Amino acid sequence: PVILLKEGTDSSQGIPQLVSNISACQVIAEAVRTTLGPRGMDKLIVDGRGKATISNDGATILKLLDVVHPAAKTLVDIAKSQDAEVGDGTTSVTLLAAEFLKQVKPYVEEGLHPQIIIRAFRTATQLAVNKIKEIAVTVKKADKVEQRKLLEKCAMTALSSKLISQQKAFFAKMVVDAVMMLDDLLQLKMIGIKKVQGGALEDSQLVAGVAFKKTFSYAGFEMQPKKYHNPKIALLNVELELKAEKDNAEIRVHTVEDYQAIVDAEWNILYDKLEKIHHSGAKVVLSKLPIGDVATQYFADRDMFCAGRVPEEDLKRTMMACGGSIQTSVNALSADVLGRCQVFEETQIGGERYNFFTGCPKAKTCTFILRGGAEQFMEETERSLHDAIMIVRRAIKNDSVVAGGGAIEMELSKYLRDYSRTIPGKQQLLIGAYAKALEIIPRQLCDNAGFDATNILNKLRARHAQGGTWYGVDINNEDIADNFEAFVWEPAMVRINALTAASEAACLIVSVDETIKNPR
Amino acid sequence: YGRPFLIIKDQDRKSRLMGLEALKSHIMAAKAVANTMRT
Amino acid sequence: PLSVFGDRSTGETIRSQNVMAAASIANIVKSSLGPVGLDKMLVDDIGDVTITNDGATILKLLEVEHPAAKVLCELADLQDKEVGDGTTSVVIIAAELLKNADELVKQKIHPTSVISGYRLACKEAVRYINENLIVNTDELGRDCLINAAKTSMSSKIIGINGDFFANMVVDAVLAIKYTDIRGQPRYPVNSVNILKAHGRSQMESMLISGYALNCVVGSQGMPKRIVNAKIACLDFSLQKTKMKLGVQVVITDPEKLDQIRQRESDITKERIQKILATGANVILTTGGIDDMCLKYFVEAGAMAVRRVLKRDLKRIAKASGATILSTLANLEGEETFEAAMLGQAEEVVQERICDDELILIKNTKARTSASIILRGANDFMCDEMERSLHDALCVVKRVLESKSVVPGGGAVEAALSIYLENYATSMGSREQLAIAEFARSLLVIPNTLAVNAAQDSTDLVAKLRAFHNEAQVNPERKNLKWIGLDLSNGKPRDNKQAGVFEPTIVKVKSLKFATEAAITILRIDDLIKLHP
Amino acid sequence: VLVLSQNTKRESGRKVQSGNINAAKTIADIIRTCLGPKSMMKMLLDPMGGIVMTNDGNAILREIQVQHPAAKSMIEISRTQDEEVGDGTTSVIILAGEMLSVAEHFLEQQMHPTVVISAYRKALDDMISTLKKISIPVDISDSDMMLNIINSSITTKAISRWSSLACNIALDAVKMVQFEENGRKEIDIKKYARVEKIPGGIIEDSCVLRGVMINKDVTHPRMRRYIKNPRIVLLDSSLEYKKGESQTDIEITREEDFTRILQMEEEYIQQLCEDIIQLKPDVVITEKGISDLAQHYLMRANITAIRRVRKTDNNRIARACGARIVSRPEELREDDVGTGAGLLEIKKIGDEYFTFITDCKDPKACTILLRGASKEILSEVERNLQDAMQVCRNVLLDPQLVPGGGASEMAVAHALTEKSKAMTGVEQWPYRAVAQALEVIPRTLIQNCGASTIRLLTSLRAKHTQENCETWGVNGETGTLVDMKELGIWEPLAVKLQTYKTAVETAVLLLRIDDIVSGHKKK
Amino acid sequence: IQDGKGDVTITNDGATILKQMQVLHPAARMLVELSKAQDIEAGDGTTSVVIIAGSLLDSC
Ligand SMILES: Nc1ncnc2c1ncn2[C@@H]1O[C@H](COP(=O)(O)OP(=O)(O)O)[C@@H](O)[C@H]1O
Ligand SMILES: Nc1ncnc2c1ncn2[C@@H]1O[C@H](COP(=O)(O)OP(=O)(O)O)[C@@H](O)[C@H]1O
Ligand SMILES: Nc1ncnc2c1ncn2[C@@H]1O[C@H](COP(=O)(O)OP(=O)(O)O)[C@@H](O)[C@H]1O
Ligand SMILES: [Mg+2]
Ligand SMILES: [Mg+2]
Ligand SMILES: [Mg+2]
Ligand SMILES: [Mg+2]
């Protein structure tokens, strides 16, 4: 007879569907399991075009994996949310979610209500958030250098398990000076990231102005001086070339008199505009529209520099660094709409021509010159720089950091285990499993270097029970030490966000009962 | 009955390797390149 | 590098694949374990329904191309061949042990320590089973056997009507009782003829005191009711005389071919007359019977059955006291026949059972036989009833062979898990985790029972763990280890009183097989599959 | 490719039970078309190329190819019911379908199947007890009662206009089939009542011959064809010179050895013929061939010979005459000569010779002759006669009678409802559900008759509530409430008991399946 | 080890594993004969000799 649904619709039950979902989610944890601790490594993803993608962050790995499973897409969503929120612990949330799923798999297979599990997860997440907010340990009034020292320590901690781990003390001051000079709203788009082929890691410099690549020149570019003491930058936006007035125009000349009159008046208008631009006392002319050869030859005879085809972002950065404004017309070129700098040179760095505009006391932006490899190395360096900038911005906006490592997780697990000895019934087993699943961070941190994770975990549990609050792990000492005194500080909001994302993902996965699929 | 589930797109065409064999292959390729660009 | 011409894995992938295969094999037959489980169905390509739930048959008729699956199947087959009961519980315990050991292997623990801890826990559990033994002779005997048979037949199709089948099995076991060489009494099985015939319900299947043959009479002119007959077992075909290959016939005179052709039948006639010279009435021939022998038996007034099995003839000769004679020769050079080796029976009446007849033999004078004629709907129900009866007979034999009964329902597993958990604190090394995992692996039977019963699993598990923990301490309350578990109400009942009654040798063998299977699999870390 | 099994499809849960219940309901709705005297006939087309036109419940179900295991189990239980008692093949299927359809109401209320099976067995036991308690005895010496029972049993088939003779035919066949040999064993086999089908003639020409009817002819026209009181003898061995399996060779070197052998062959043939004609027989019936010399000798001795016979035909001839088959001609004796004949006439039925052995002393094997139109009518008449004979045999084996139609079902339902008030727990709802499930036969009969169940059902339910109101049924011809004592409709108790037991067993077997595994290729 | 006919073999001796591996390279086809000769002569240490030979050939 006539069928009900469309022919080719896949259906499932409840317990087997949940078991399959758990088994599928357990595989995603193995992809971001090695990239975690400082001794961890990275992965290499190849697309269908033949381009290598080397990135240590779990977000890029999950984005380049292209998963088609309906249950495995929950990890990518929470990873993207964590990357957009603070941009730090992208794999810790996935590991915690996988541990929670593996812990509740036997409880689900035994025959438990999913609503009770969701309520227990919510209660445990609320208790962990309250405990973290209680032991946040924040300050109210500090010194001027204390904030800079805290920022440098946070940058060195965030740049510990990255590729530039050998030079973490050099980029810390750079990112500190970059974030400190970012006005008050913290504009991330104002920081320019340039990648020039050639040079090592020690050749990377940080300018206090703006810098961009040399655009396409003409024939009168090598006839003008490329060095000025105290010039005047005039940011314009009109085209400086010989062309028609309007595209919807028509000239109906009569004789040759008016023809020659118009021919001469065109050049007269061009020269009047070039003089009005020159009468403003400027020396550097920058515009978004391409500049013709006539204006380039006219500016070279008066010892003036000019450059066209300037991007919008570069022009905005130069305006924010100097202190000018975008002028469309050239009929109002005063003195308050012109830039000012202390030096302007043009050297050869890596075989490419670049311009520098350093020496601006009223600048609110900067430009980074990242060197090293060729493509993957520069991309990893840019990702690490962005992560450090985000960490410093969060530390400035929240001024609340806790001890790093596996001390906070151990303290939370101990608190949850001590609290489980009060509420009877079936709620004790769920809280105990949630507390036992929180100890996966130190085990994975110690297993990345080939150490005895069981003995270290037992020693940490004994130290937490005998007290001895911020006791974490150690890689160089092959033992345990105080992470609060080892200058290891991390933002406390990152852990809260990761815990909330993991709880939401676990609740959404448990809430899934029947999965219906449609063809095409 | 453990039914296999589809995870990565086009899983029946791609290949995944551990790590030690990949490092050994990369070292061998680098050695071959250095031997070729030696004369 | 390394040209192997095939496929290979690494280290953890093969272990994960084996664990997944074991879990799938366990979940395949995880709905027919407890007494509340239902049966399955197996259909082939031509359309043959196979309704069964013993576990061993389902694993044998599965055809899986996995090494761990084949290992579990052969282990279940060995368990069924050596015992016959508990073919799925051992596989489930082995799968749970493998799943528990996988977590320890993933925690950077050497498999040798885990294997040593598992062996120590198994040895401690085996040593602890002897502490909870009940003497079979101290109870009533008949009631204990009836309870054991009802427990063994509780997870079958005749679980409700277990008051008559258990008594019939006990009577058949008591009738089929063989004595050894003046020592311990034996109880041989696989000797009772379990016939299958469609007819009425299963409650009408009574016990036939004697033997039952699945053959019909030869000629229609022979009587079908002989009182006080003589059973004569023969092991040679009753046909005409035929020369061998090396002995040819070369007729040289026409006055001898007719004489030879007449003697060829006269020899058989004289042999038949000498066989029937002792006054025999029942003659069984395993070979063929010609028309002349049939006419002779009809004229003499005696029955003749052709195409008889060897085992049936041996059982008939052992029950009636006759001797199977393959020839008529003696200690000289004359073919004679004595009357001292003739089996004396009583009433040999042929009864028709639904459009087919079969000869039944009642009790004789030497020993006592037993025959069961099971009646049901079609062939699947008859096969299920036969399998259930065979399992009940095997359980009764294993119980009577070793006078040692042990209560069931999930209390023994909880007691063993508590004992191993309390003993693990005395080690102090890395084997404590292995002992704890071995103890937790035995708790999968109550969980599966509660899942199949659709009751509270965690609550019942907690109640059992709280009731068994108080039985260890406080010597004034040492009778709390025999509470058991009920699936119809969800509360500990009497159990040990008269509810569940299972032997201990079966459980010991199942635990040993599960330990051996968990040991022989955990020592695998690489696979090499060649291409055909 | 790395998988555990290949081309395997496993399905578990409530879907398997739902599909089984749907298949059972479809089978019951298909088989419910043929029920009651107001039913219609069907027509099946076998893959061979014939035409199957009948009305039996088993002959129609056996010609339907299905693929569901539930349908296969239903066909199997129907075939077992037809091979057990012979009658009641559709009622059992309808009852099983109704019991499986009314069982799905409890499966959706988180009810365990073990309690359902326990309630089913407890209801089956009570139904058996009630049927044994309401048993009414009957005498076997009354021929009118047996004729009325046979007529009421065959009133549904197409012999409703000719049962005036078929009843007597079945009675005579049952009386002649019953034979007592040695001991206290009284068997009633059906392998001796051969039914012959000859196309042509009218249906009123059928009768029961006191003997058999072999479709053969004489070997020579010079033999006799009409004997008064002949002495029919039997043989088994061949009447010709055969070879030997002992590998014999006759090496001759003279000249007259061939003539000597050829003369000795004829001498041996004549000696065998003289040994055959020893007690002066008349009609020789052998199973093998007869040479020309033996035929000439029997013609000279005025003996009739018939060759190429069957074993069943020879056994029937020996049972009708009263002799035994002899293999060796030298051991004929005297008691082996059959003298129970009285008429040996060879007629022609449509250009075909037929042997008739009529008028015997005390025959124990008869041959029913049927004359109809084509072959389907003859097959239907033979099936109806076999069903009537099986019903008569089941009645003679157990002298018990119960009111048919729908009175016994209503009485059992009332007895189960009056006893269900003392029960408690979860075993009360399935009991009351299966107690009212027995009304599927009278409801179907009313639907097939006048198609007015909404009134007759409650009229019969309100009538059986009284005391002496357990024999009130529903007339399938008109459609009114009439008494079964004055109508004359009766049925045996063993058939109903077997039907109930088979239905309960099928329901129990089908209510314990929740997994389907297919794709293992057996081996 | 799983052969082409479907026989699953589990062994710990290096000689049996090398024989069941079925290699195709002569440098690998000589090691199986070496292990067979070592097992025929002595019987034990069939894996240590292969390890020593591999270490020597790698140091060469
Ligand atoms: N120098 C260090 N000392 C102690 N713990 C560290 C150090 N560097 C990183 N960690 C730990 O390693 C974990 C991984 O951090 P990271 O790799 O920066 O981001 P993600 O959490 O996304 O992998 C953090 O939870 C942190 O506690
Ligand atoms: N009547 C009963 N009461 C309580 N438990 C039972 C009963 N019958 C069986 N069981 C439990 O079911 C389990 C399986 O028994 P059984 O079916 O005989 O073995 P298998 O499942 O291997 O065929 C046993 O461990 C036993 O404890
Ligand atoms: N003339 C009649 N009067 C009353 N009841 C009848 C009559 N004919 C048939 N029946 C009833 O109809 C039921 C069905 O009978 P029928 O169709 O002949 O065979 P089956 O029982 O195999 O379906 C019987 O149980 C019988 O009681
Ligand atoms: Mg990070
Ligand atoms: Mg059992
Ligand atoms: Mg009928
Ligand atoms: Mg050695």
Short mmCIF file of C-alpha atoms in Angstrom, two decimals, chain A residues 234-403:
data_model
loop_
_atom_site.label_atom_id
_atom_site.label_comp_id
_atom_site.label_asym_id
_atom_site.label_seq_id
_atom_site.Cartn_x
_atom_site.Cartn_y
_atom_site.Cartn_z
CA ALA A 234 47.86 64.53 3.65
CA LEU A 235 45.38 61.65 3.38
CA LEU A 236 43.15 62.28 0.35
CA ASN A 237 40.61 60.21 -1.57
CA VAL A 238 40.38 61.72 -5.09
CA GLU A 239 41.93 60.35 -8.27
CA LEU A 240 44.98 62.23 -9.58
CA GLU A 241 45.10 61.26 -13.25
CA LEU A 242 44.07 62.57 -16.66
CA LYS A 243 40.52 61.34 -17.30
CA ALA A 244 37.04 62.57 -18.17
CA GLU A 245 34.83 64.49 -15.76
CA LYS A 246 31.63 62.41 -15.72
CA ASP A 247 30.69 59.22 -17.55
CA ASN A 248 27.31 60.67 -18.56
CA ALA A 249 28.63 63.79 -20.31
CA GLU A 250 28.72 64.96 -23.92
CA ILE A 251 30.66 67.88 -25.43
CA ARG A 252 29.24 69.32 -28.67
CA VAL A 253 32.03 71.60 -29.86
CA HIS A 254 31.55 73.96 -32.80
CA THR A 255 34.94 75.04 -34.17
CA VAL A 256 38.57 74.46 -33.20
CA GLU A 257 38.63 77.50 -30.88
CA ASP A 258 36.42 75.98 -28.18
CA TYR A 259 38.10 72.61 -28.80
CA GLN A 260 41.55 74.01 -27.97
CA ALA A 261 39.99 75.98 -25.11
CA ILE A 262 38.64 72.79 -23.52
CA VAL A 263 41.92 70.96 -24.20
CA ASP A 264 43.84 73.69 -22.37
CA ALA A 265 41.25 73.99 -19.58
CA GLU A 266 41.56 70.29 -18.77
CA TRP A 267 45.29 70.65 -18.07
CA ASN A 268 44.61 73.96 -16.31
CA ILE A 269 42.19 72.26 -13.91
CA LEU A 270 44.68 69.42 -13.40
CA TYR A 271 47.49 71.86 -12.57
CA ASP A 272 45.21 73.90 -10.30
CA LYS A 273 44.30 70.76 -8.35
CA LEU A 274 47.96 69.70 -8.15
CA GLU A 275 48.88 73.16 -6.84
CA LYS A 276 46.03 73.20 -4.31
CA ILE A 277 47.30 69.85 -3.02
CA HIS A 278 50.85 71.25 -2.97
CA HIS A 279 49.84 74.57 -1.39
CA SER A 280 48.81 72.76 1.82
CA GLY A 281 52.46 72.31 2.81
CA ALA A 282 52.31 68.52 2.58
CA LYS A 283 55.07 66.15 1.49
CA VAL A 284 53.42 62.70 1.55
CA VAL A 285 50.25 62.09 -0.47
CA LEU A 286 48.21 58.93 0.19
CA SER A 287 44.93 58.09 -1.54
CA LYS A 288 42.83 54.99 -2.12
CA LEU A 289 42.31 55.67 -5.83
CA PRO A 290 45.21 54.92 -8.20
CA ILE A 291 47.41 57.90 -9.08
CA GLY A 292 48.38 58.52 -12.69
CA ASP A 293 51.81 59.19 -14.13
CA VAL A 294 51.23 62.93 -14.62
CA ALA A 295 50.79 63.59 -10.90
CA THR A 296 53.71 61.28 -10.10
CA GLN A 297 55.99 63.22 -12.45
CA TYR A 298 54.71 66.55 -11.10
CA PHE A 299 55.32 65.55 -7.47
CA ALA A 300 58.83 64.26 -8.22
CA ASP A 301 60.00 67.64 -9.56
CA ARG A 302 59.25 69.34 -6.21
CA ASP A 303 60.88 66.62 -4.05
CA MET A 304 57.62 65.14 -2.76
CA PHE A 305 56.58 61.56 -2.05
CA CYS A 306 53.33 60.05 -3.33
CA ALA A 307 51.72 56.61 -3.23
CA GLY A 308 48.38 55.39 -4.54
CA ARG A 309 46.16 52.32 -4.25
CA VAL A 310 46.24 52.50 -0.45
CA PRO A 311 43.84 50.02 1.22
CA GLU A 312 41.06 51.21 3.50
CA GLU A 313 42.38 49.45 6.61
CA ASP A 314 45.90 50.79 6.09
CA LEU A 315 44.57 54.32 5.56
CA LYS A 316 42.44 54.08 8.71
CA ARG A 317 45.42 52.80 10.70
CA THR A 318 47.61 55.64 9.41
CA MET A 319 44.91 58.19 10.27
CA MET A 320 44.52 56.78 13.79
CA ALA A 321 48.30 56.75 14.29
CA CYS A 322 48.99 60.27 12.99
CA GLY A 323 45.77 62.12 13.78
CA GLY A 324 44.34 63.32 10.47
CA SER A 325 41.08 62.76 8.62
CA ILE A 326 39.86 61.37 5.30
CA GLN A 327 39.48 64.36 2.96
CA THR A 328 37.48 63.76 -0.22
CA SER A 329 37.72 67.21 -1.82
CA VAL A 330 40.92 69.23 -2.17
CA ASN A 331 39.18 72.61 -1.77
CA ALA A 332 39.51 72.62 2.04
CA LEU A 333 43.07 71.56 2.93
CA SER A 334 43.83 73.36 6.18
CA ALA A 335 46.36 72.56 8.92
CA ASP A 336 44.24 70.48 11.32
CA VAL A 337 43.51 67.82 8.67
CA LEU A 338 47.17 66.94 7.95
CA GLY A 339 49.28 64.23 9.54
CA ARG A 340 52.58 64.57 11.36
CA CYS A 341 55.42 62.16 12.07
CA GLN A 342 59.00 62.19 13.36
CA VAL A 343 60.74 60.06 10.70
CA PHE A 344 59.87 58.41 7.38
CA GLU A 345 62.22 55.99 5.62
CA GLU A 346 61.95 53.11 3.14
CA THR A 347 64.37 50.20 3.54
CA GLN A 348 64.59 46.76 1.94
CA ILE A 349 63.37 44.00 4.28
CA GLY A 350 63.25 40.50 2.83
CA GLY A 351 63.52 41.75 -0.75
CA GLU A 352 60.30 43.78 -0.45
CA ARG A 353 59.87 47.55 -0.19
CA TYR A 354 58.10 48.72 2.97
CA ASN A 355 57.36 52.13 4.48
CA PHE A 356 57.61 53.16 8.13
CA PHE A 357 55.82 55.98 9.97
CA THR A 358 57.24 55.74 13.48
CA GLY A 359 57.59 58.58 15.95
CA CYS A 360 54.01 59.47 16.89
CA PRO A 361 53.35 60.34 20.56
CA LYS A 362 49.57 60.57 19.99
CA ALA A 363 49.31 57.19 18.24
CA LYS A 364 46.78 54.57 19.35
CA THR A 365 47.81 51.64 17.12
CA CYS A 366 50.84 49.66 15.99
CA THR A 367 52.02 47.22 13.32
CA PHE A 368 53.60 43.80 13.84
CA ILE A 369 56.29 42.42 11.52
CA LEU A 370 56.27 38.63 11.89
CA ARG A 371 59.17 36.70 10.37
CA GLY A 372 60.30 33.08 10.43
CA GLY A 373 59.26 30.34 8.03
CA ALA A 374 57.21 30.85 4.87
CA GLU A 375 53.49 30.20 5.34
CA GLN A 376 52.61 27.71 8.08
CA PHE A 377 55.14 29.17 10.51
CA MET A 378 53.85 32.71 9.92
CA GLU A 379 50.24 31.54 10.32
CA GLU A 380 51.06 29.80 13.61
CA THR A 381 52.90 32.91 14.81
CA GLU A 382 49.92 35.11 13.92
CA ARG A 383 47.56 32.73 15.72
CA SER A 384 49.75 32.75 18.83
CA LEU A 385 49.96 36.55 18.73
CA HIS A 386 46.18 36.82 18.44
CA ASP A 387 45.71 34.39 21.33
CA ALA A 388 48.14 36.36 23.51
CA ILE A 389 46.41 39.63 22.60
CA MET A 390 43.03 38.15 23.53
CA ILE A 391 44.43 36.82 26.82
CA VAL A 392 45.89 40.22 27.70
CA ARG A 393 42.62 41.95 26.76
CA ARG A 394 40.65 39.57 28.99
CA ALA A 395 43.11 40.08 31.85
CA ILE A 396 42.70 43.85 31.48
CA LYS A 397 38.90 43.76 31.23
CA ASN A 398 38.45 41.34 34.15
CA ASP A 399 41.62 41.75 36.30
CA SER A 400 40.91 38.36 37.91
CA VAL A 401 43.30 35.44 37.36
CA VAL A 402 43.85 32.20 39.27
CA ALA A 403 46.63 29.61 39.48
#
